Amino acid sequence: TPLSHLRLTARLNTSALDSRRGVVRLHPEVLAALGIREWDAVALTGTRTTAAVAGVAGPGVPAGTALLDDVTLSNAGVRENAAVLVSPVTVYGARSVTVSGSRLATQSISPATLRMALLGKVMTVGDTVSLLPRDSAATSALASSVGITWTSELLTVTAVDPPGTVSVQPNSVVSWGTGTPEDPAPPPTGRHTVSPQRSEQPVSFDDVKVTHPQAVKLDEWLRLSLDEPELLKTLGATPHLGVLVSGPAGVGKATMVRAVCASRRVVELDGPEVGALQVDERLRSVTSAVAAVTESGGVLFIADVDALLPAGNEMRPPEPVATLILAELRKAVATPGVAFIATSAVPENVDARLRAPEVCDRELGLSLPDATARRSLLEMLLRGVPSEDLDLGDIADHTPGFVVADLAAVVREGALRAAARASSSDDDPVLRHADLEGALTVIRPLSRSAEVSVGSVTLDDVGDMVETKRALTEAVLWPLQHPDTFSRLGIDPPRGVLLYGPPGCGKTFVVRALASSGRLSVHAVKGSELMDKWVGSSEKAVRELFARARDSAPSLVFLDEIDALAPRRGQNFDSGVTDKVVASLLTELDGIEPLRDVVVLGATNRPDLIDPALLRPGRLERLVFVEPPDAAARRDILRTAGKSIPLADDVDLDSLADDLDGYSAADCVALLRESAMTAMRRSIDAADVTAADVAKARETVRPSLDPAQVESLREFAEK
């Protein structure tokens, strides 16, 4: 894919409340020309190369101007009012990030605190990052009540992994530079901690289960295994318990586990810290933790185990040490009075041998908070926090795709805006609605820090698809959001949905937008990846997926590229591997049919390549055809995507829509992208997209839809 880029003028961001937060201000036309949305990271290049998060510039900022704070100008090697190269950058989740600082901060600030303070932010080697933008007895009490422990010291990034540009994730490890010979070496990492029975917990079990109903099921599993083993023995069930908890990053998976195990003794390892250890020290750490949990019993908990036991991509299989690490865990699970719980944002990022009867026999998927749940979280985050008229309902309504981690960061930022307002007024800081709303202009949700992340796309980002949205809302959202009314009205349990249409028309895009609603756990796979890329049995991956969905209800099961997952008999010959998968799939689909809190949806560009047994009643029987965007639809798509692109008077998006027959939704989005770029390159100071700019763009952006293939898809439901 061609790497788009623009030279802009770099002006110093004069707003202190907008500076030193890892945010660069760009005109929307730049975002359009570069092919990115707000909150996407950009590469910034002067004499040096750095990266920052693209935030939309306020009014009064011409398209040819980028606003950079003092540290960004320094990191990019750009003088004020000088030229800067801006371009989209690939930002992977960091395995590790090594930072350097004073001997005092190196000894006083834990790696967990570092990760919390820098969560979601982009890092590049050589960069100067700030843990806190600003810095009295009432203000310090405020900072601590909101959870600000660290200070405002500027650090430097001495290393990242993988190389290039990375973002700090919950499964990342952020550790000090080890290390300057003069200064003392920093404390050891990757070793287990023990929390005794009935220990003081920051977040209670009651607090957790109001937005995470899955905590009730986890608690019930633990109690049966550890407290009432004769009940399970009477039924012939297994007394052992291994659980893999998954769900969006920072949604609160680890906090839920600690809350549920509050009355138990917990032996806890930090997956990333241990995973970063030298291979032999890594094994010893796991071994020490297993012997400790089996010495007295209780819960062995590994937060973010995907950093410790990565799934591997065949080019690199799992390391040999993983076999021995798994043997230790397996030994723990078989121990009476011992239970094993591990977390991971994406389950398939963990070694396949962990998702097995011998270690983790069952799984639990958490969900994004809906608007109601978000308001519950904000009120919880603001206990003992001096405030006025916060209007939390409005803040909750304006944070879709957010998680508690983000909301916490929103509140911390709000405390800074209050403390800044306080210092000028000399009054004691008191949070108002302005602070929280102002925080939203600088805080990037974790769901936007890396698509394919649940919450990155919302229905507003989807132009048009009125009829498709309508059908999906009624077929998927309505039954899940109203279980009892549907049952008492004698409405059938949610029918399986097959979503199909020509490429670049949003059949996948709209599902991802739909899946960001909240109060609904999403369990999604791409047909190709599960079959070809994943190390492990594909047939067991199917049963695993559905079992996690059943246990995490209300659940949506998204089988994208369903044609690859279940092709027609004869298309594949792999010693019966495909057969077992399809037969297992049919079996799972039939188990989902009577359920009311689980919906299954398959998507494909080629429905005729699916085994017809998938399309029988009780299975994927609701056929939703996604039409290519007509004249009406193209108007919406253009207007949605081109909303903030300044246009010249001789540009009419409506008449343009009528002329774009054969252009898919993606084609239209690309025509605006190309148009904006054509205008930016033509004249920076005369940025307004002209009719000629669009005319030139149409030379490179061609129609992609085949009228015969489109006809073939439309007739599919009747044939």
Ligand X SMILES: Nc1ncnc2c1ncn2[C@@H]1O[C@H](COP(=O)(O)OP(=O)(O)O)[C@@H](O)[C@H]1O
Q: CB of residue 510 vs ligand X: minimum separation in angstroms? A: 7
Minimum CB distance to ligand X smaller for 136 or for 149: 149
The nearest distance, CB 569 to ligand X, in angstroms, is 24
Contact between 509 and ligand X per CB under 6 A = yes
CB of 505: closest distance to ligand X in angstroms? Answer: 5
Residue 624 assigned as binding residue: no
Q: Compute the least distance from the CB of residue 691 to ligand X, in Å.
A: 23
Both tokens of 207, joined, read 């607090």
Looking at beta carbons only, is 68 or 713 nearer to ligand X?
713
Which of these segments, 35-43, 92-100, 213-221, 251-259, binds ligand X (CB under 6 A)?
251-259
**Nearest by Cα to 342 from 296, 280, 300:** 300
Query: For residues 669 and 33, what is the distance between their CA atoms, to the nearest angstrom?
Result: 11
Question: Which of 67, 116, 277, 419 touches ligand X by CB under 6 A?
Answer: 116
Q: Which of 63, 637, 680, 705 binds ligand X (CB under 6 A)?
A: 637
Please provide the distance, in angstroms rounded to a whole number, between the alpha carbons at the two ends of the chain.
Answer: 38
The Cα 716–Cα 391 span in angstroms is 50
CB-nearer residue toward ligand X: 509 or 625: 509
Indicate if the alpha-carbon torsion angle 543, 549, 550, 556 is positive or negative: negative
Please pick, from the candidates 86, 368, 381, 680, the single residue that binds ligand X as defined by CB under 6 A.
381
Burial class (CB in 10 A: 0-12, 13-18, 19+), 401: buried
Footprint of ligand X on residues 514-533 (CB under 6 A)? none
The span of 124-132, 286-294, 470-478, 635-643 binding ligand X (CB under 6 A) equals: 635-643
Give which of 243, 355, 239 is closest to 301, Cα–Cα. Answer: 243
DSSP secondary structure letter of residue 625: E
The verdict on whether residue 506 carries a ligand-binding annotation is: yes
251 binds ligand X (CB under 6 A): yes
| Cβ neighbours for 221, distance < 8 A, ≥ 6 positions apart | 241, 243, 362
Q: Which of residues 597-616 bind ligand X (CB under 6 A)?
A: 605
Would you say 463 is a known binding-site residue? yes
CA angle 46, 48, 54 (to 5 degrees): 65
Is there a contact between 560 and 512 (Cβ–Cβ < 8 Å)?
no
Closest CB to ligand X among 408 and 614? Answer: 408
Site for ligand X in 457-486 (CB under 6 A): 462-465
CB of 254 to ligand X, least distance (A): 3
Shortest distance, position 250 Cβ to ligand X, whole Å: 4
Residue selected from 52, 71, 249, 557 as contacting ligand X according to rule CB under 6 A: 249
> Could you say which of 404, 514, 542, 672 contacts ligand X (CB under 6 A)?
404
Non-local CB neighbours of 678 within 8 Å, separated by 6+ positions = 689, 693, 694, 696, 697
| Binding-site string for ligand X from residue 202 to residue 241, where x marks contact by CB under 6 A and - marks none | -x---x----------------------------------
Per-residue contact track with ligand X, 339 to 358, x per CB under 6 A?
Answer: ----x---------------
Tokens of 388: 């006025």
* Cα–Cα distance, 332 to 341 (Å, whole number): 11
To the nearest 10°, the Cα dihedral for 218, 221, 227, 232? 180
Residue 170 in the binding site for ligand X (CB under 6 A): yes
From CA 440, how far away is CA 438, in angstroms rounded?
5
Find tokens 């879709």 and name the residue.
400
- How far is 545 from 539, CA to CA, in rounded Å? 10
- Give the separation between CA 461 and CA 458, rounded to whole angstroms: 6
Q: Strands across the sheet with 96-100, in order?
A: 128-130, 154-161, 96-100, 173-176
**What's phi and psi for 371, nearest 5 deg?**
-55, -40
Strand duo 242-246 + 6-12: pairing: unpaired
Least distance (Å) between residue 256 CB and ligand X = 6
Cβ of residue 286: shortest distance to ligand X, in angstroms? 20
| Residue 250 annotated as lining a ligand binding site | yes
- 500 lies in the binding site for ligand X (CB under 6 A): no
255 counts as binding ligand X under rule CB under 6 A: yes
Task: Supply the minimum distance, in Å, between the C-beta of residue 561 and ligand X.
Answer: 8
* Contacting residues for 37 by C-beta, under 8 A, at least 6 apart: 31, 461
Nearer to ligand X among residue 53 and residue 446 (C-beta): 446
- Least distance between ligand X and beta carbon 348 (Å): 16
**By the rule CB under 6 A, 450 interacts with ligand X:** no
Binding to ligand X in span 184-203, by CB under 6 A: 203
Site string for ligand X, 641-680 (x = CB under 6 A): x-----------------------xx--x-----------
Q: Is 35 in the site for ligand X (CB under 6 A)?
A: no
Q: Which is nearer to ligand X, 46 or 502 (CB)?
A: 502
| Burial of 678: CB neighbours in 10 Å, binned 0-12, 13-18, 19+ | buried
Tell me which stretch binds ligand X (CB under 6 A): 28-36, 253-261, 274-282, 679-687: 253-261
Site stretch for ligand X (CB under 6 A), options 328-336, 502-510, 524-532, 608-616: 502-510
Among residues 290 and 462, whose Cβ is nearest to ligand X? Answer: 462
The whole-angstrom separation of Cα 133 and Cα 378 is 22
19 interacts with ligand X by CB under 6 A: no
Q: Which is nearer to ligand X, 116 or 680 (CB)?
A: 116
455 is in an annotated binding site: no
Query: Is residue 508 within the footprint of ligand X (CB under 6 A)?
Result: yes
Q: Which of 11, 20, 209, 253 binds ligand X (CB under 6 A)?
A: 253
Nearer to ligand X, 374 or 421 (CB): 374
DSSP type of residue 529: I
Distance CA 300, CA 293 (A): 6
Asked if residue 111 binds ligand X (CB under 6 A), the reply is no
Residue 302, interface with ligand X (CB under 6 A)? Answer: no
Q: Is the dihedral of CA 580, 586, 592, 594 positive or negative?
A: negative
Residue number of the CB closest to ligand X reads 506
Region of 154-162, 281-289, 506-514, 529-537 interacting with ligand X (CB under 6 A): 506-514
Q: For ligand X, which is the closer residue by CB, 333 or 564?
A: 564
- Across 57-120, the runs of DSSP E, i.e. the strands, are 65-68, 82-88, 92-93, 96-100
413 binds ligand X (CB under 6 A): no
Q: Closest approach of Cβ 36 to ligand X, in Å? A: 11
| Length of the chain counted residue by residue | 719
Question: Comparing C-alpha atoms, which of 693, 627, 701 is closest to residue 660?
Answer: 701
DSSP secondary structure code for residue 154 in this structure: E
Query: Toward ligand X, which CB reaches closer, 330 or 526?
Result: 526
Question: Contacts with ligand X: how many residues (CB under 6 A)?
Answer: 35
Q: What is the DSSP string of 102-152?
A: -HHHHHHS-HHHHHHHTTT-EEETT-EEES-S---HHHHHHHHHHT--S--
Residue 251 annotated as lining a ligand binding site: yes
> Using the 8-state DSSP alphabet, how is residue 303 labeled?
E
Q: Which of 126, 213, 493, 503 binds ligand X (CB under 6 A)?
A: 503
Question: DSSP for 593-607?
Answer: TT-SSEEEEEEES-G
What are the binding residues? 250-255, 380, 463, 504-509, 605
What are the binding residues for ADP? 250-255, 380, 463, 504-509, 605
Instruction: Give me the residues that bind ligand X (CB under 6 A), please.
Output: 116, 170, 203, 207, 249-255, 343, 380-381, 404-405, 408, 462-465, 503-509, 605, 637, 640-641, 665-666, 669
